[PDB]
Amino acid sequence: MREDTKVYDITIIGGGPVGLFTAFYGGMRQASVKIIESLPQLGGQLSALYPEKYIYDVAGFPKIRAQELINNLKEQMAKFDQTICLEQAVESVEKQADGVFKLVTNEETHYSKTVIITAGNGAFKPRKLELENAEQYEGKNLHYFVDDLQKFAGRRVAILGGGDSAVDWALMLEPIAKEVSIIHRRDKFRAHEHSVENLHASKVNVLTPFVPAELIGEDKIEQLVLEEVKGDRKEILEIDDLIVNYGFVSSLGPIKNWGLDIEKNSIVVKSTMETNIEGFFAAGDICTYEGKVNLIASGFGEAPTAVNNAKAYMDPKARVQPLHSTSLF
Amino acid sequence: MREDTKVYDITIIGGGPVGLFTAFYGGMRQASVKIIESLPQLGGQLSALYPEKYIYDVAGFPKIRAQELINNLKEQMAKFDQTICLEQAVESVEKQADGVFKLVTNEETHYSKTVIITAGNGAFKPRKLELENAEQYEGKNLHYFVDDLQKFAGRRVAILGGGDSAVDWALMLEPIAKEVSIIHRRDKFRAHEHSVENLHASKVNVLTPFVPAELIGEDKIEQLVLEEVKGDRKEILEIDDLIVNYGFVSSLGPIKNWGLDIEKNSIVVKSTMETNIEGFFAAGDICTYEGKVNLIASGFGEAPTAVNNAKAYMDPKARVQPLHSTSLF
Numbered sequence: 233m234r235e236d237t238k239v240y241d242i243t244i245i246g247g248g249p250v251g252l253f254t255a256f257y258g259g260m261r262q263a264s265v266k267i268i269e270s271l272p273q274l275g276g277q278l279s280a281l282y283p284e285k286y287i288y289d290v291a292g293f294p295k296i297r298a299q300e301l302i303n304n305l306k307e308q309m310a311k312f313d314q315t316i317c318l319e320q321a322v323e324s325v326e327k328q329a330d331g332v333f334k335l336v337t338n339e340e341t342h343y344s345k346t347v348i349i350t351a352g353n354g355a356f357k358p359r360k361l362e363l364e365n366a367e368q369y370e371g372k373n374l375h376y377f378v379d380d381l382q383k384f385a386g387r388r389v390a391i392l393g394g395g396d397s398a399v400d401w402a403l404m405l406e407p408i409a410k411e412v413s414i415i416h417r418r419d420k421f422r423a424h425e426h427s428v429e430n431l432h433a434s435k436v437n438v439l440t441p442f443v444p445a446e447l448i449g450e451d452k453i454e455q456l457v458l459e460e461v462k463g464d465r466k467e468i469l470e471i472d473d474l475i476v477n478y479g480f481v482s483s484l485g486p487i488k489n490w491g492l493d494i495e496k497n498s499i500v501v502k503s504t505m506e507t508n509i510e511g512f513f514a515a516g517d518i519c520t521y522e523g524k525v526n527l528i529a530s531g532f533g534e535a536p537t538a539v540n541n542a543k544a545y546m547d548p549k550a551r552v553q554p555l556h557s558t559s560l561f
Numbered sequence: 562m563r564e565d566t567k568v569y570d571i572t573i574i575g576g577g578p579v580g581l582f583t584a585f586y587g588g589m590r591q592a593s594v595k596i597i598e599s600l601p602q603l604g605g606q607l608s609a610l611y612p613e614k615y616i617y618d619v620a621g622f623p624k625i626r627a628q629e630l631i632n633n634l635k636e637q638m639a640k641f642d643q644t645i646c647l648e649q650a651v652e653s654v655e656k657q658a659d660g661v662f663k664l665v666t667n668e669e670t671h672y673s674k675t676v677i678i679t680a681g682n683g684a685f686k687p688r689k690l691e692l693e694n695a696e697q698y699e700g701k702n703l704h705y706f707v708d709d710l711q712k713f714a715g716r717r718v719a720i721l722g723g724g725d726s727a728v729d730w731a732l733m734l735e736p737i738a739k740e741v742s743i744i745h746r747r748d749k750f751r752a753h754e755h756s757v758e759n760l761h762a763s764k765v766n767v768l769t770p771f772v773p774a775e776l777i778g779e780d781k782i783e784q785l786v787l788e789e790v791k792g793d794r795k796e797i798l799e800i801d802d803l804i805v806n807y808g809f810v811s812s813l814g815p816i817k818n819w820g821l822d823i824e825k826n827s828i829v830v831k832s833t834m835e836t837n838i839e840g841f842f843a844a845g846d847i848c849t850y851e852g853k854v855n856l857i858a859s860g861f862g863e864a865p866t867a868v869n870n871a872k873a874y875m876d877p878k879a880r881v882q883p884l885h886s887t888s889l890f
């Protein structure tokens with residue numbers, strides 16, 4: 233655990249499209265801004281689930297690719313400064329006796345005058361390996377997210393899963409690692425067929441249809457035991473690193489432990505976007521009210537409403553109504 | 562007075578940016594849509610009051626010219642069918658005994674299952690010439706809205722006003738008209754400095770500081786008499802056409818007589834965007850609620866909220882939540 237003692241004006245929970253636009257508007261209102269995001273990148277459901285698909289119902293865009301919209305939002309918010317904390321899932325939020333919010337994640341403790349939660353359906357997290365003692369190896373040689381390929385240089389690597397993530401990493405590691413195995417529970421892969429063709433074409437050891445049965449290693453994982461899906465046959469692999477790419481899940485989880493009023497598995501808001509905790513606002517798919525629609529356009533409307541009301545909360549002489557952007561730049 | 566006996570699903574009062582996106586969204590939800598707009602053009606405050614200016618706080622646009630955003634919205638809604646009624650200001654809205662809304666304008670009577678008012682600050686009207694016989698010439702050779710500039714080819718034109726609209730028309734007409742004069746009540750123009758420099762360098766006859774004194778003509782205007790401001794001098798122009806560019810005025814006007822709940826020139830809405838009259842919704846600058854900010858982004862979020870709740874009102878079996886646009890097309 234570490235601690236960032238700087239009190240930010242606005243801390244945003246979740247860097248999907250609504251959080252990104254919220255960050256922009258915080259900058260517009262001369263607020264210091266932190267974004268905390270569960271995944272190793274920004275973009276929420278758009279970047280995670282349909283980055284290549286076209287969106288037709290965002291105002292002003294006859295058609296726009298999801299990732300393109302996210303890229304536009306990043307460019308928009310780049311005019312201002314934020315501190316962005318990726319791979320952090322907020323698990324605790326408490327308004328302290330001095331009014332300052334304290335936020336705790338899996339990695340770091342943060343402070344803020346206001347919090348705006350833009351969590352969607354809750355934190356995106358990788359699917360964990362469902363083997364009794366898998367957690368023991370987290371922080372050692374069990375990897376869920378991969379960034380630096382060179383740490384696997386000259387090493388025996390096993391990758392679990394059959395999607396684009398598992399296949400892509402297997403192909404990138406083949407020329408770097410001593411040996412690479414990919415283990416998937418069907419003979420048919422879920423990854424793009426061309427990537428799967430290259431995989432079979434490559435020197436990657438493909439083990440299908442198998443599931444992980446056991447992890448062995450007192451300290452570091454040393455052996456991986458596989459079991460065939462149809463039948464009882466087992467295989468043991470000697471490995472230096474295990475990468476698990478089983479996709480992602482989202483849930484509210486600890487968002488329900490902060491004293492917020494929750495209805496429809498979402499955070500209730502007044503028309504100002506404020507929750508039942510003053511200084512704590514919500515926007516986008518995480519929020520609810522009578523007539524709420526879960527759309528990007530709706531969230532993009534909620535964002536400035538939240539930021540502008542947050543600004544008035546922080547500075548009772550600040551007008552909720554912003555000045556014209558046409559004049560300000 | 563004429564009557565359109567077709568009962569529309571959704572009829573939108575005002576074709577500013579929020580009414581345009583509302584109209585698009587109606588199409589998205591497979592509703593029959595009519596837009597009724599007071600001016601001879603769509604675009605609201607953007608097109609009328611700042612078409613040339615860059616907007617920076619619409620989600621997904623690092624910067625977009627106001628008129629270009631309007632153009633984008635028109636392209637977006639062109640995917641579906643709408644009935645557009647320009648040059649019609651709504652004077653009366655009544656929810657009849659059968660539940661059907663009856664809307665009466667200056668030109669026509671309309672019917673609708675639901676109404677979504679997107680009127681901003683009220684119906685735009687051009688500021689008119691305050692001379693006693695001026696109205697007599699409307700529909701003849703006195704012009705408040707100019708579309709077919711070619712019809713001024715080879716003609717003697719006088720333009721009234723000192724803003725960008727007047728100056729732009731003078732400069733655009735100079736190369737094709739026989740003669741162009743611009744008449745303004747101060748030696749200083751309100752138009753942009755470079756345009757004014759172009760104006761003085763051109764062959765346009767600039768008459769300042771003058772106001773119109775008299776229109777002469779039994780049928781069409783044949784002569785325009787001007788008088789110097791704070792002076793003792795008149796001028797008479799022989800003209801074929803008179804264009805007046807005195808800007809725009811807006812007010813709620815008869816919107817206050819429909820039995821709606823109104824505060825501070827705004828229609829009070831609950832979180833569903835519904836007014837106190839069931840089936841009658843509002844969005845954009847016209848609506849209010851605690852925390853409301855008059856922004857384009859805000860209005861763009863309110864629009865689909867209104868449409869989707871109007872859909873649920875018309876068919877309580879149909880859902881509020883739309884299917885994905887990524888999927889629908």
Ligand SMILES: Cc1cc2nc3c(=O)[nH]c(=O)nc-3n(C[C@H](O)[C@H](O)[C@H](O)COP(=O)(O)OP(=O)(O)OC[C@H]3O[C@@H](n4cnc5c(N)ncnc54)[C@H](O)[C@@H]3O)c2cc1C
Pocket residue numbers: 245246247248249250251268269270271274275276277278281282286287288289290320321322323350351352353354355356357487515516517518526527528529531885886887888
């Ligand atoms: C296949 C598909 C197609 C779609 N098509 C459309 C469409 O065409 N038009 C449209 O308008 N909508 C569409 N949607 C819905 C749209 O994706 C959502 O409305 C939008 O993603 C909501 O944005 P958001 O920022 O509120 O939430 P999200 O996109 O879910 O982002 C929230 C972010 O918050 C992070 N987060 C959450 N909790 C925490 C925490 N505790 N700590 C740290 N980080 C956290 C999450 O990891 C996530 O990155 C579609 C959805 C799907 C799945």
Ligand SMILES: Cc1cc2nc3c(=O)[nH]c(=O)nc-3n(C[C@H](O)[C@H](O)[C@H](O)COP(=O)(O)OP(=O)(O)OC[C@H]3O[C@@H](n4cnc5c(N)ncnc54)[C@H](O)[C@@H]3O)c2cc1C
Pocket residue numbers: 556557558559574575576577578579580597598599600603604605606607610611615616617618619649650651652679680681682683684685686816844845846847855856857858860
């Ligand atoms: C100079 C200026 C700069 C601005 N800069 C920004 C900016 O940078 N960013 C931002 O977000 N916002 C900005 N705004 C505010 C922005 O223009 C408004 O939020 C936006 O125009 C509201 O859109 P609308 O569709 O609700 O209303 P409007 O734009 O007012 O359109 C309403 C339309 O309804 C019509 N109408 C009204 N009543 C009737 C009736 N009874 N019958 C028929 N038609 C009717 C009117 O003629 C009008 O065309 C600015 C405003 C101004 C004046």
Ligand SMILES: NC(=O)c1ccc[n+]([C@@H]2O[C@H](COP(=O)([O-])OP(=O)(O)OC[C@H]3O[C@@H](n4cnc5c(N)ncnc54)[C@H](OP(=O)(O)O)[C@@H]3O)[C@@H](O)[C@H]2O)c1
Pocket residue numbers: 280281359362392393394395396397398400416417418421422443477478479480
């Ligand atoms: N280059 C690219 O275009 C690229 C790169 C990375 C990610 N993506 C996209 O990002 C999204 C995420 O994909 P990603 O692979 O992380 O995740 P994914 O598509 O969800 O794939 C997860 C893989 O894990 C397997 N799995 C899950 N739980 C398991 C379990 N309990 N036991 C055994 N196997 C299990 C699944 O098996 P089953 O298939 O049998 O269900 C699947 O093969 C996808 O849309 C993907 O296309 C694209």
Ligand SMILES: NC(=O)c1ccc[n+]([C@@H]2O[C@H](COP(=O)([O-])OP(=O)(O)OC[C@H]3O[C@@H](n4cnc5c(N)ncnc54)[C@H](OP(=O)(O)O)[C@@H]3O)[C@@H](O)[C@H]2O)c1
Pocket residue numbers: 609610611612613688691721722723724725726727729745746747750751753772806807808809
């Ligand atoms: N090319 C561009 O960039 C462009 C193009 C079109 C519009 N716009 C913008 O759109 C906005 C609207 O401009 P627009 O020119 O329609 O309108 P405008 O700026 O309001 O100008 C109206 C002109 O009419 C004059 N006027 C009004 N009533 C009068 C009266 N009774 N007698 C004499 N003169 C009268 C005003 O005089 P005074 O100046 O003395 O008040 C003013 O010069 C402006 O911000 C403009 O910059 C920009």
Ligand code: NA
Pocket residue numbers: 352496497498499517518519520526
């Ligand atoms: Na929700």
Ligand code: NA
Pocket residue numbers: 681826827828846847848849855
């Ligand atoms: Na208003």
